[PDB]
Design a protein around this ligand. Sequence first.
Ligand SMILES: NNC(=O)c1ccc(Cn2nnc(-c3ccccn3)n2)nc1
Ligand SMILES: [K+]
Ligand SMILES: [K+]
Ligand SMILES: [Zn+2]
Length: 356
Amino acid sequence: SPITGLVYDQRMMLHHNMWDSHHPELPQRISRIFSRHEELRLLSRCHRIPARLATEEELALCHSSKHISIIKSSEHMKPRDLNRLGDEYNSIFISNESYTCALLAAGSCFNSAQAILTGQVRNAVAIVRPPGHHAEKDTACGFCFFNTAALTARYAQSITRESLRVLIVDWDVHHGNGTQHIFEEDDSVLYISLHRYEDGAFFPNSEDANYDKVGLGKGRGYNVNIPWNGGKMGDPEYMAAFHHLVMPIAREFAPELVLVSAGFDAARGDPLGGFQVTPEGYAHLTHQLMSLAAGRVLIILEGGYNLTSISESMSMCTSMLLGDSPPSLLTPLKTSATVSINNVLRAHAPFWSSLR
Ligand SMILES: NNC(=O)c1ccc(Cn2nnc(-c3ccccn3)n2)nc1
Ligand SMILES: [K+]
Ligand SMILES: [K+]
Ligand SMILES: [Zn+2]
């Protein structure tokens, strides 16, 4: 009821890079975040939600039978065939434990969404790996095998109603290409992504991440890309994007469930992101999202590679979900961030009355 759920399972650490033990998507990303929850005495304040495996029928909510079979077959592959398989995708490493870990990341979030929708908890945090937002219906991409957040939105609809309004806010520094594509023609799942773009120089290097990709057919206006260019964005820019775009659109949509594709790679210290969002910044973003869907928010870990930065930033999010007071939070925005916000406003004003 006025309770916060938490899911963490050390078995998700088994997925590893056998060729490059220093690859940034480390097993210790989740163990360090979990340890930070214990240090801050946040863990004991949460209701512990068990991890479970997603079933193949559950993966079929978003992914093709071919994709599921190929990833599933990797459990039995010798190192040379895992190397060959991983090479078929853009930025993927596979071990014999990868498939099981991807299943545990998905099942953990389904048990979390279930705990929220059955009223066992009000909100929840899922300390999971490998991430999921780059995974497409038919392919793995950018360290992602199955689209955990997209699958969770479909799972939530499968236990309530097909038309359950789900908002996905993706604040990982990378565009969730897989999430956008899965729901592109869908008006029941509003996808809002903030991401470093650099006119396509930043991963995943596609114009699909630009502000003018507003969705297709009945999904027109239900895909909101907030792309950053020419600038090391931080709290002022993220707070402004939430003030002018994320919160007015989300309030008009009136979601019944909020999923956060919460990568912490836009954080200060992240070696891949190059951005400066502070743990207090993430706490303010989380607190804002809690005003939606009667507080039904599920925070799902995506990217984020500086171990101290992700541990502090995610723990700060859990603290906000537990009802703790938002911490003290800057400056005028980078000129290109105003350009980006204004481009999104022009793109989405025809679909949202709150922007007009
Ligand atoms: N949420 N998505 C992501 O977090 C995401 C996905 C894909 C990439 C591409 N990439 N960048 N650096 C690398 C890299 C660095 C060191 C060793 C091997 N690889 N790989 N970046 C980030
Ligand atoms: K994003
Ligand atoms: K959509
Ligand atoms: Zn990322």
